[PDB]
Design a protein around this nucleic acid. Structure first.
Lengths: 180, 46, 46, 100
DNA sequence: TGTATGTATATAAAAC
DNA sequence: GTTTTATATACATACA
């Protein structure tokens, strides 16, 4: 199809290689939060790339919200420099994209109950609990959120081609259960 | 020099929109001083 | 510009001075020294 | 108890300056100056609690925020402030301590 | 009694 | 339990 899912979020991990004093980081980094009574990490944000970082005492870090592999790595590097400039002997090691989320619109209503019954082995649909159908694909190990409006959410990918392939696999099934 | 000293009741955020419920404070804005019981802050981060 | 501010400020000066008087008298300093503190503080404050 | 943040206010600095003078300029008992400031901290707190009516509204761009040790710091740019009048400020710094 | 925000529900993933 | 993102329902407080 000429429909290609749009990437909405990417999560990554990086090892800085040193231990950090979270309070020092907090007191010296702009736009940073540190509340050990809520979450044992420093939450830090930057505008470009617009992302959020969970920095830890172990030197472990998680970066979220990026919409491209390039942005994800770039932001991660920015947080790294900021930590280094504060005085910590940080390094940028083992950068790894752990999850990629995507979404698309097929532009036609979908018969969810029908979809669920035909593909019961993969489908979960309790509209009273949640309005979308939870379809767990085995092929590319991807989880899709199918809605009666024709909008799709695809998540759990290590690389974008998985999101892409997961949609190409599901598309025929969507046409198969089009409600019009 | 445009400094507000006070207490916070609640601070929240949704996307880049922050809201703050401030109490019992004093501010100096443009060489003038104000004292307040309550204050609400609606600010958009980028 | 605010009036409540000046009123609050007045309450603060008057309230602090009278409370501080005990300690001032304990330290055997001087009632007129307390009066000076009041006048200078209010002077700086303008 | 009682935070010392209000010493940074116009009225707080003025007090500091007055006392510093009595100490240096004169021979007025220091340490007592501290006693006075301890009184200041409490008074400003109760006064701002029991003797205020104004409600303020600040709207603008959030240039910077931050949290550490029960203190929130915000720096609002290009903001309009509403008293109960509408005032505009290029840059406003806000420091808030936990009410609890 | 609408327009607003809020809560909640459900998905992947890492770090503590 | 935190943080991020698409998506969609009910429900719950407010506000003039």
């Amino acid at each position: 199809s000429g429909i290609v899912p749009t990437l909405q979020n990417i999560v990554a991990t990086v090892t800085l290689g040193c231990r950090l004093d979270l309070k020092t980081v907090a007191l010296h980094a702009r736009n940073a939060e540190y509340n050990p009574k809520r979450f044992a990490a420093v939450i830090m944000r930057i505008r470009e790339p617009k992302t959020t970082a969970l920095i830890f005492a172990s030197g472990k870090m998680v970066v979220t919200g990026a919409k491209s592999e390039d942005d994800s790595k770039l932001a991660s590097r920015k947080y790294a420099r900021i930590i280094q400039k504060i005085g910590f002997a940080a390094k940028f090691t083992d950068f790894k994209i752990q999850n990629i989320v995507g979404s698309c619109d097929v532009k036609f209503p979908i018969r969810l109950e029908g979809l669920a019954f035909s593909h019961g082995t993969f489908s979960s649909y309790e509209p009273e609990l949640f309005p979308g159908l939870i379809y767990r694909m085995v092929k590319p190990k991807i989880v899709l959120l199918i809605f009666v409006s024709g909008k799709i959410v695809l998540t759990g990918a290590k690389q974008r081609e998985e999101i892409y392939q997961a949609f190409e696999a599901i598309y025929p099934v969507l046409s198969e259960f089009r409600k019009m | 020099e445009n400094l507000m000293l006070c207490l916070y009741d609640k601070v929240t955020r949704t996307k880049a929109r922050w809201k703050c419920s401030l109490k019992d404070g004093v501010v100096t804005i443009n060489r003038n001083d104000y004292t307040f019981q309550k204050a609400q802050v609606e600010a958009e981060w980028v | 510009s605010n009036a409540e501010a000046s009123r609050v400020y007045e309450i603060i000066v008057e309230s602090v001075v009278n409370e501080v008087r005990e300690d001032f008298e304990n330290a055997g300093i001087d009632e007129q020294t307390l009066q000076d503190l009041k006048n200078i503080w209010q002077k700086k404050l303008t | 108890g009682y935070y010392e943040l209000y010493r940074r206010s116009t009225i707080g600095n003025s007090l500091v300056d007055a006392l510093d003078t009595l100490i240096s300029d004169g021979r007025i008992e220091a340490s007592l100056a501290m006693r006075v400031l301890e009184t200041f901290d409490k008074v400003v707190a109760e006064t701002l609690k029991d003797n205020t009516q104004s409600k303020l509204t600040v709207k603008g761009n959030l240039d910077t925020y931050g949290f550490c040790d029960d203190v929130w710091t915000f720096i609002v740019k290009n903001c309009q402030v509403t008293v109960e009048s509408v005032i505009s400020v290029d840059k406003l710094r806000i420091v808030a301590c936990n009410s609890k």
